[PDB]
């Protein structure tokens with residue numbers, strides 16, 4: 331007679347508009363779980379929960395797993411809305427939830443004892459792109475933003491304005507657009523009229539790809555520099571290709587070419603299991619899942635509250651290098667990157683699409699986050 335299985339739950343947007351993200355995030359968790367055929371002597375099972383990229387669906391599926399199967403350990407979500415909602419449910423039963431989403435609140439006003447987050451949020455993304463770019467481009471004084479009229483976009487814009495004030499450059503204007511907007515010609519001509527030195531795209535996902543592609547086809551790169559603050563890294567770069575990307579400045583959470591102990595391992599793993607290089611969604615869920623399983627293994631405990639406490643202040647090898655979970659706000663302290671798209675001729679392989687120009691840690695003091703644990 332075998333031991334009772336223990337189940338780890340991946341919350342992934344397997345269907346709907348974010349199916350591609352979910353596919354690779356799921357691949358990431360699966361790689362982590364496969365490294366533990368058993369965990370503390372018990373067979374380790376993985377169960378995917380489809381959030382459908384919808385907060386309501388995420389909550390109901392998590393609630394069912396908690397009630398019916400005694401679920402406690404979760405990793406994933408694509409959307410901040412889903413993660414905020416899920417965080418409350420996991421928090422109520424004293425489980426553990428690690429997420430890659432980017433809303434600042436996850437580790438701020440809405441933090442809880444059960445919830446941890448790997449990605450750098452808007453505060454750091456803005457600072458690790460714009461600040462090093464200002465250093466690279468001392469004569470770039472006039473900065474124009476294009477922003478989705480939505481909470482994540484406004485947070486980025488809020489940050490871009492703080493940086494402009496702090497560093498003596500000029501925010502010369504802004505164009506808002508809806509999350510559904512497919513047409514950017516009008517906002518691009520607004521930018522042209524403003525005569526910027528840098529066009530800053532504060533949109534994200536499919537929309538930023540469409541915006542950037544229109545900007546480039548419009549002739550923008552011949553007139554001014556372009557920065558996409560919040561890019562999806564490799565998988566987005568592959569879709570756009572070097573003709574679009576060449577010379578464009580890009581912010582990202584992860585880059586497969588960075589030489590670190592865990593990244594070397596991860597690249598070998600994805601090459602041997604899927605025949606590809608790791609992308610951001612894959613890497614974020616790989617590490618988020620590995621931290622949880624490693625800490626269960628280290629503590630000898632399946633108790634959520636015990637594992638969560640052990641994760642506070644934990645230092646470990648991660649995809650960006652040596653990373654630590656800050657105890658006070660449950661934020662992973664790690665690099666965010668500024669890259670620039672490469673010219674086709676400088677590429678060594680199909681994935682050699684961008685060059686890292688800067689990497690660094692920008693995080694607020696815990697006392698400024700609103701997180702009170």
Ligand SMILES: [Cl-]
Pocket residue numbers: 342343381382383384388407408409412413
């Ligand atoms: Cl989601």
